[PDB]
Amino acid sequence: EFDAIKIALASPDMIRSWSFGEVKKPETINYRTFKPERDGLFCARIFGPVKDYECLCGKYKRLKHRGVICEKCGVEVTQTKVRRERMGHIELASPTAHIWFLKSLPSRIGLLLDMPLRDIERVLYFESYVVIEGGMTNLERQQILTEEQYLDALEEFGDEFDAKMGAEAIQALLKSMDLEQECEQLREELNETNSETKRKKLTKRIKLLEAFVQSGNKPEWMILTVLPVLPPDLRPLVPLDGGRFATSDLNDLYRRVINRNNRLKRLLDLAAPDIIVRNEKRMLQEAVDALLDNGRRGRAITGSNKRPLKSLADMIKGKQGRFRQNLLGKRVDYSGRSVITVGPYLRLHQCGLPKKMALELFKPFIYGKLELRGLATTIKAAKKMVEREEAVVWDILDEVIREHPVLLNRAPTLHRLGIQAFEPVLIEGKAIQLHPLVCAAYNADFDGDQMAVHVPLTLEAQLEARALMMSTNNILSPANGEPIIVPSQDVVLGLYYMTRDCVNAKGEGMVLTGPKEAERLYRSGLASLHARVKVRITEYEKDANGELVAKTSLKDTTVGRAILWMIVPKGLPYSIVNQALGKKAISKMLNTCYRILGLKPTVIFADQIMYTGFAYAARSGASVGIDDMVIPEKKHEIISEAEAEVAEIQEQFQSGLVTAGERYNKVIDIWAAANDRVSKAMMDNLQTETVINRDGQEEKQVSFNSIYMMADSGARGSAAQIRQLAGMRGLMAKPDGSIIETPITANFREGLNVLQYFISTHGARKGLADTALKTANSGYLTRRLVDVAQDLVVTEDDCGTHEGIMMTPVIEGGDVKEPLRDRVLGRVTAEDVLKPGTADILVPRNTLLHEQWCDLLEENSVDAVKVRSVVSCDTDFGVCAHCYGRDLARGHIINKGEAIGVIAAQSIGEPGTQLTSSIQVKNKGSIKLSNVKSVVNSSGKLVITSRNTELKLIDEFGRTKESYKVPYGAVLAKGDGEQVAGGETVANWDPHTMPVITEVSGFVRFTDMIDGQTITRQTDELTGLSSLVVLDSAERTAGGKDLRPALKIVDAQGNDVLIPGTDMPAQYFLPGKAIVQLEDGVQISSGDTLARIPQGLPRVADLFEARRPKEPAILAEISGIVSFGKETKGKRRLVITPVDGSDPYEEMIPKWRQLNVFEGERVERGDVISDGPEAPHDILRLRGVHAVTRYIVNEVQDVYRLQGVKINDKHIEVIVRQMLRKATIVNAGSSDFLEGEQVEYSRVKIANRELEANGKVGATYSRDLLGITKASLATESFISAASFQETTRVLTEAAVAGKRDELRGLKENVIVGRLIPAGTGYAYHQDRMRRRAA
Amino acid sequence: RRRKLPATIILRALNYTTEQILDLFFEKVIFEIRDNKLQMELVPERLRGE
Amino acid sequence: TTDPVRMYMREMGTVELLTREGEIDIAKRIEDGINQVQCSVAEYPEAITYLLEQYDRVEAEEARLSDLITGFVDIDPELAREKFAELRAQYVVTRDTIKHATAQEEILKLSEVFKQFRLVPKQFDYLVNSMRVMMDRVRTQERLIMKLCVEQCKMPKKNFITLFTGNETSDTWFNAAIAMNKPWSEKLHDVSEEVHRALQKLQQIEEETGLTIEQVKDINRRMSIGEAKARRAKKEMVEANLRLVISIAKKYTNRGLQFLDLIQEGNIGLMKAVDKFEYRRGYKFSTYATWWIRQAITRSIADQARTIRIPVHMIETINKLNRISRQMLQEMGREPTPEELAERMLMPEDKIRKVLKIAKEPISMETPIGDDEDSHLGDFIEDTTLELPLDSATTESLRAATHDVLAGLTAREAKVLRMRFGIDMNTDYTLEEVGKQFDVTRERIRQIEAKALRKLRHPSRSEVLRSFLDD
RNA sequence: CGGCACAUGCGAUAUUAGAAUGUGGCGCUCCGCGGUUGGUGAGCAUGCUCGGUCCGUCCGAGAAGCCUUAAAACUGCGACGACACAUUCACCUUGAACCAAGGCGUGUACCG
Ligand SMILES: [Mg+2]
Ligand SMILES: [Zn+2]
Ligand SMILES: [Zn+2]
């Protein structure tokens, strides 16, 4: 029907072109009979007829005419939907400033005239004057006056002088301005003169000007001359039942505007004095500005009510505007809603659905089939037949259901498994039966939550809901490859009871010919469910190429494992059922069955697991009781010991021996020690308490306690809650966040008295309040993440680039937190990776890595893999499928088309509810030190002069088991490459003492060290070695204030000791508190100290927003020799000396704060100059795009893996891509852009590849990271920038620019109601894009 | 919750000059010149922690 | 702060109050202004003779004593006859003595006895605006001659004005300055016909009113200065008495119209008061002006403060109901039933119900229903103007069935039955119109129509159409 | 480095003291009456004629009268409705009202 949406300003000729009438009178409807009043706000000749094809008088009532207008009273006899469509206008007598171009924060009349906003409001409220091109006599153009100054200027200059006041003055200012003359002027001011922040504002203003002239706008259209009015059926005045009406408040607003306009015309007829008409023009300004956007004035309230009324921008902007209440989400027919329930007799491609809901939803289908089958002659008979519910319609309804999927939906639809299709089975009842294994996908418990069904009407939607959204398709999460149809609670208890073994049972150690007589023995009662038994089983395997090689053997197993073995499909080995089968084990079982046998055996296998789990859980009789929580006999003894120990610390505090804080810390440590002893008592009193006998004395085993099975199976709860039921419960925290010294020494099996329970109540209520508030903030985080990233669609099959990031394991300080295998599994390689024997190609350059390839990775010794990442792709306006990866509900590579920005942002924001010395080496291997520069001291050790040293514990297989960020100046015992043992502290630094260690060996001296000024004479009481030690800034005198104390070295001859290898001596400058221990002329060795210097979810919403950290890590711009400049300004000049390039960079550092580097050293670009958090801007601007995306993914994966929630890294990487789309160009060159202009990276990239393919020079850019609430509004498509965030600024910024929106990316297409260019509609948009302009 | 105003103006809104405002909110140290040298009257509690 | 009521107060706070004698002084300035505009009328004979012809329309029984003027300085029809008979003798003895300075005192006496007449502002302002239109045509011809010669031919305005302003009548400026052989006299020779024609039209305007523009310019600049004096005086009095408008409009604030709307309607009423003020009665300005201000404000609140505009007497009835139900509520005690308002008032108690119904202000469609959710009143109002889609299905099936049944008839019967009703065409056609369609007899169409309906009423055609009537 | 000012985001989805008087003209009022052009669902399930008959009933083709035209429209005569103007009496007398104060963020302008 149409293409791209265009937006611009409205000329008064354009507004008279729209309108079909002038609304001259403030009436709405006649009061006695409710015909509309001519010609009021509700008119006939202006807008349309009231009834379908009927004049208002009655001369034309039927379809005899449609073109005529009645000459008694004007009515264009048409449909009344036309009254929903035609618009009106108001001829405003005096002109009026448009509030959107006056009061939004980047004010357009404000910085279009280059005039401050308070002076503009001073002109518009008739408080002052302004000259309007008044020649050149004495007064400038923008020079305002007052009334007395106006009398001054008029008596001093009677003529050739022009200065009005009010809206006429601003309109004359905007009309008088010649734009391109000032364009030349500002280009000259940006060529010669340089006033940095002011010229940045100036180049912003010239950007606005040459964007304005490039549009088709005129400036004086920012002042309203003729104001359009909205159609009547958008501001309706309709009868309620009872003779009383509902008006919209826009009727009040247009009534006030029309009223004051008629008053101002009536006053200018009667030639009113100036005070009265200036009052009336201010009032008309207020009326119009209250109509366009009420709330940017004194909030003009309505009549007979204190509540503020609702204007137009109130109806566009906000939670209740059209963008978010009636366009992005609509209330939908063919839907239903009821309470959900279990019904375990279902296969998971089907759900229950009530007969009454199925009759109410599918009414037109039933109507169609009944008039086809001739049981109803007409359709009214079909209505009465389904109304009376005769017995013939239920067979008809069973025909129309049979293969027609419905959509089930739970209301917090966070991730994309919230809407799934099913096939209905009709239910005698009124509750939707919902399959149990599906419910963990919904986060739906059955405690009264109610779900909604929708019906795909058309045929394509039926095929979509079957092919894409049927429940058997979604058995893998989009967040990771883990199964989401994991068996949840009863079924895992039935399994964990079924596959276990007690040492004596019926049929102990007998022999069985197969699983079938295992079932015949259990169900006859001769042999027990669990007894260790040799059976004969036949397992199949995929040894040959997709071939089922059979091997049979006598496995030593139990009875119940053999009974479960009938349910395992052919492909799996027997070792998947030979263990105890908790929840983790059954998730691994379903994962291996899917990764081997495909989809169909996994679906039917999940159904059979659920059936057998519920059945043998029923046969289990696993029942909780009061004897099932064994209290330790060692409980009250440990509590009495702790009660004596707190009395010991109480006597030690009443003796004045300790202070309060160390008392507090000792008491909390001994109560935590008592709690840990109680936990290790109760666990050993539960889990091994069952001790029974077979052919001998005794033997212990794991317990058949009910609560131990319910905690060990992973069904519900873990040992924290079992601890709070049996042992003492924890140490509660008061509302301070402080934690009470008297813990709750009673569990729930014992009673709690009043004070303990009253203390526990605070933790409970804080928990509930935090769950509510974190729910709200997680919703907001999901919304920002999807609205920054709906534009991204997999569009090309392959780009073919060599880019990529470097996947390494994420080990840090302790053991492995996420290995190499489950990071790289699913991605694709950029270049080929090689064996530790080099030139051995183990994978080629770009193959999709699946599980056998990661097996090939682990059988070799690979540690680091280069991987194609979506943040470094080459594709225009999307991500090519061969670069993205594979992870989806399927296991193959991502298809061409499917939206991954939306699934990525949902898979990030969906777990938002769930969110909150020396080297002690653990493991053994060989030692490696990266970026190390050290020197052997006299004591046989090794002192380190480079602080980029990374310690790696490399075993015999090349991989890294431990890493340690080596501090500067540590004391290594072993060297590098020597085989180290466990526990061996190699480097032992002093963490309280910053080292001033050297590379030299000679006589330490004083240089520029004046006694009493830079250094004081201290005489020690403990050690006794008196010295001259550097003091602070307050006490150092005005001579030695800027003069700094320095240390330097000579040998025995008196000549200056040079560093062995270079020519610079070690002259080092000490800060305050840097203790000079060794004095003038005292020998040291290599690296001795010349002195000593003693002493949750909003994290994620800070990372993706990329807010500036509070104390930033400072980083060197370019690599070079670091040096100091001037002293004592509060800052210091950090000067860099590159060897090859031009040096003269210096940066202000607040010199109170502890630095890291010494002046004698040299830093690399992007190396740290101090510590603390760092901004993402610095990491992107110095190191590289790969480094900043690694920084974001490692930080936010630390935040998620702290809670223990897996999210695949593709999603975070593609949000990082959607962050940094904008990039400011540095060198313009042959391009059209500017030296400070901000344009998106894809637009400058297609410009350069047209120019760089030619012989011309391109345009060099500066990549610029933006936050998610700012990279989503800085968009070349304004409806996606106007649908969620600040609306008024976006519509005015895109209305002054004449910006054109090409619908580009799923937000606009949901808005405008056509197909989506991601999913099934991608083929349609591809056909149209091939058709469009070709 | 209107704009921040200086405090003592409300004291000057209650018919108070600077004399008795400083009398009500402070204690008076008396400097006498006993024939020379501008001496100081002393209460010893005034020297605490100084 | 913006708060434009306060900006209005500060804009009017500079104007100070008046003493009790300064009002009389401003009123005397108003008298001087109307004196000078009536004396400006007193020199213009065409307005005189125009009102004389209108008075002959009075004497021809086509007008009334209360149409032309009202009142004399000592309104009777015999008084009108004798005063206008003396006027008649005066203007038959006055005008015909131009045959100049002999007639001038006669014209002044005719002017004085014309000023002895108290006019209606309709005729008065008509004469004023007609003089204004005449002046605008004269200025249009002057600026036309200027835009012909001065700017285009580079003739200086000083040499333009030199023999033009001072004679303006004849060719002494035109024809002599061509003959005086100036360097600009040649450039007239392309424009001499149009300049001369505009000069002759200036002479034409002189011949219409009898005197030259040398007199007419001084007449209407005297009128303009007198009226500007009067308007400055009335501006000064209005600027003074804004305070009275505020002190009155403090009372009616909560009656549904905004505060500044009230004071602006009061300022319109105050300007009407300054128009119709008379100090010679001796009352202060306050006592006279207060009724006009309250009248304008009450009329405005009754006019424009309601969505459905209910008229003046209806609002008087509503305010009587609220006043009497305020009085009776403290007399009886419970609240008055309208049965008590039957005997309390003079209305038949069935009209009191509808007066009670009309006086209800409509609800805002965003008035919140309970618990303050996004649920407002607007999300509950159903649309009753749509048709249900089942009715559309019946209409589709009925068109299909009727098309299949009319296919079963003959050619003429189906064609007549489609032509007669609105079936799948434009407007229906009646008997004589279908007769002019087919060139056939009127009654024959009725016979064919009855035979067609008789064919349709029988079963095997009546079944599928009787199915569309539900019982 | 402070102050004043302003803007902007979040604060979950889903389900629930006026009173009285007169005159004038007007009608996008569907309210009685008159005149004017001017119709339709009735006799007619064959009132009439002729032809076919499965029939004495239904199909196909013709002509006339009586009777339903104030319907639809137009224009005037009554009622009502709304509107304008004018008058009489009484009172009134020169700078108002207003809410709300308990969260977490982001940013801009001005001055020192
Ligand atoms: Mg629930
Ligand atoms: Zn009409
Ligand atoms: Zn790519």
Side-chain angles (χ1 to χ4, degrees), chain A residues 759-771:
Chain A
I759 292 166
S760 174
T761 308
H762 163 67
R765 184 173 288 179
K766 181 178 178 180
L768 294 178
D770 284 330
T771 53

Side-chain angles (χ1 to χ4, degrees), chain C residues 5-6 9 13 17 23 240-241 243-244 246-247 250 252 259 276 284 286-287 290-291 294 298-299 309 311 313 316 320 323 326 371 373 375 410 412-413 420 430-432 441-444 446-447 451 453-455 457-458:
Chain C
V5 47
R6 183 66 67 193
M9 295 296 173
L17 296 174
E23 297 174 352
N241 297 117
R243 306 280 182 88
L244 181 61
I246 300 171
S247 67
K250 290 189 291 186
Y252 292 104
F259 182 76
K276 293 181 184 294
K284 292 184 286 185
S286 303
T287 303
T290 303
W291 179 68
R294 291 179 67 190
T298 302
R299 184 178 183 270
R309 184 179 64 84
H313 62 86
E316 290 181 353
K320 283 179 68 177
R323 186 179 181 181
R326 181 176 65 87
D371 294 329
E373 206 260 333
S375 67
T410 65
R412 292 180 67 191
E413 288 176 350
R420 187 179 181 86
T430 61
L431 289 174
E432 186 177 1
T441 304
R442 179 184 175 91
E443 182 65 28
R444 184 61 178 170
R446 295 182 70 188
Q447 182 63 256
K451 185 177 179 180
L453 295 178
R454 182 178 65 88
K455 189 70 177 292
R457 289 171 190 269
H458 287 173

Side-chain angles (χ1 to χ4, degrees), chain A residues 922-984:
Chain A
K922 290 171 68 177
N923 297 112
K924 186 180 182 293
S926 179
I927 191 167
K928 296 291 184 182
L929 285 82
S930 295
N931 291 319
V932 62
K933 187 181 288 185
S934 65
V935 64
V936 179
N937 56 3
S938 64
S939 296
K941 303 293 183 183
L942 189 61
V943 290
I944 301 167
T945 61
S946 64
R947 64 190 185 274
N948 203 0
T949 301
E950 186 178 2
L951 186 66
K952 293 183 185 294
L953 186 63
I954 297 295
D955 56 353
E956 64 188 3
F957 288 160
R959 67 184 68 188
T960 312
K961 294 170 72 177
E962 291 293 329
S963 288
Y964 293 96
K965 180 174 72 68
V966 176
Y968 180 75
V971 183
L972 281 168
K974 298 291 186 181
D976 183 74
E978 293 180 354
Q979 292 182 356
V980 296
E984 184 178 2

Side-chain angles (χ1 to χ4, degrees), chain A residues 630-842:
Chain A
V630 178
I631 304 303
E633 194 270 328
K634 300 293 289 183
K635 183 181 179 181
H636 70 279
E637 184 176 1
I638 291 172
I639 293 171
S640 295
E641 289 179 354
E643 187 176 0
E645 290 294 326
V646 298
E648 290 290 328
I649 304 299
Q650 186 69 41
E651 290 182 353
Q652 289 182 357
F653 184 75
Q654 291 183 358
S655 296
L657 182 61
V658 296
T659 63
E662 57 191 359
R663 176 187 184 271
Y664 180 76
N665 293 319
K666 182 64 178 175
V667 169
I668 187 174
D669 286 331
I670 63 173
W671 280 110
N675 194 3
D676 289 332
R677 290 179 66 190
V678 169
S679 177
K680 288 177 71 175
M682 61 161 278
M683 189 60 70
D684 290 332
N685 203 3
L686 290 181
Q687 69 183 356
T688 183
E689 182 65 24
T690 59
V691 284
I692 55 172
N693 48 1
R694 175 70 173 94
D695 67 11
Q697 293 84 16
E698 283 177 353
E699 183 172 356
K700 66 181 180 181
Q701 66 184 358
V702 289
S703 175
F704 289 102
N705 192 2
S706 295
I707 195 167
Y708 185 70
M709 293 185 293
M710 294 184 283
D712 195 4
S713 70
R716 289 296 288 272
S718 66
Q721 293 173 353
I722 311 301
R723 180 179 295 166
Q724 295 186 358
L725 263 67
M728 67 173 71
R729 55 166 298 163
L731 289 83
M732 296 303 293
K734 68 188 292 184
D736 194 5
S738 297
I739 170 166
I740 301 173
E741 66 178 0
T742 304
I744 311 299
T745 66
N747 48 357
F748 294 100
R749 185 177 185 271
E750 295 176 350
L752 280 80
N753 54 7
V754 183
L755 264 58
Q756 289 170 354
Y757 187 75
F758 184 78
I759 292 166
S760 174
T761 308
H762 163 67
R765 184 173 288 179
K766 181 178 178 180
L768 294 178
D770 284 330
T771 53
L773 187 142
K774 286 180 185 289
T775 300
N777 287 322
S778 177
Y780 178 62
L781 185 62
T782 54
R783 191 183 73 197
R784 283 185 295 174
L785 259 69
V786 295
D787 284 329
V788 79
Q790 288 197 8
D791 294 334
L792 195 141
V793 168
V794 170
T795 177
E796 195 179 1
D797 198 1
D798 195 2
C799 70
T801 188
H802 295 88
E803 299 293 327
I805 67 169
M806 200 70 201
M807 287 294 175
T808 61
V810 292
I811 61 99
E812 180 69 27
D815 288 332
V816 56
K817 296 178 75 68
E818 186 70 28
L820 183 64
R821 182 181 183 272
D822 288 332
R823 286 179 64 87
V824 187
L825 177 63
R827 305 294 294 271
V828 68
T829 60
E831 73 182 4
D832 52 350
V833 301
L834 42 89
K835 293 185 178 67
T838 317
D840 294 333
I841 295 170
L842 60 93

Side-chain angles (χ1 to χ4, degrees), chain A residues 31-94:
Chain A
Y31 75 102
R32 184 179 177 181
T33 58
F34 300 112
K35 294 183 287 185
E37 184 69 26
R38 192 181 73 86
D39 48 356
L41 283 74
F42 297 93
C43 182
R45 60 181 292 165
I46 296 171
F47 296 108
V50 178
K51 293 181 181 180
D52 287 328
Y53 294 103
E54 185 175 2
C55 177
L56 195 146
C57 68
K59 186 178 178 181
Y60 297 96
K61 292 183 179 69
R62 292 180 180 89
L63 288 173
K64 296 175 71 175
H65 300 91
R66 67 177 180 176
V68 79
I69 51 99
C70 178
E71 293 85 4
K72 288 175 94 288
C73 61
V75 170
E76 42 178 356
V77 46
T78 327
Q79 296 176 355
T80 191
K81 293 179 64 59
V82 175
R83 195 179 178 182
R84 194 177 178 87
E85 292 177 353
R86 295 187 189 268
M87 294 177 68
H89 73 280
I90 299 165
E91 288 286 331
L92 292 175
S94 181

Side-chain angles (χ1 to χ4, degrees), chain A residues 378-414:
Chain A
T378 183
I379 200 69
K380 297 290 286 185
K383 181 189 187 293
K384 290 189 285 184
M385 282 176 68
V386 307
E387 180 70 27
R388 295 184 183 274
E389 293 182 355
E390 296 180 354
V392 299
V393 306
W394 297 104
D395 289 333
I396 303 302
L397 201 154
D398 289 327
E399 290 183 356
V400 307
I401 288 300
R402 185 171 179 174
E403 295 290 329
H404 190 191
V406 301
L407 266 59
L408 269 78
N409 186 10
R410 189 178 180 267
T413 310
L414 278 77

Side-chain angles (χ1 to χ4, degrees), chain C residues 33-45:
Chain C
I34 58 96
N35 191 4
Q36 290 183 359
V37 301
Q38 287 178 354
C39 290
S40 299
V41 172
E43 187 65 26
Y44 189 76

Side-chain angles (χ1 to χ4, degrees), chain C residues 316-338:
Chain C
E316 290 181 353
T317 304
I318 294 162
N319 288 319
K320 283 179 68 177
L321 291 185
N322 290 115
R323 186 179 181 181
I324 272 87
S325 177
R326 181 176 65 87
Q327 288 183 356
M328 293 179 72
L329 187 145
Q330 292 173 353
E331 195 272 330
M332 292 302 292
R334 52 185 192 276
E335 61 183 359
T337 187

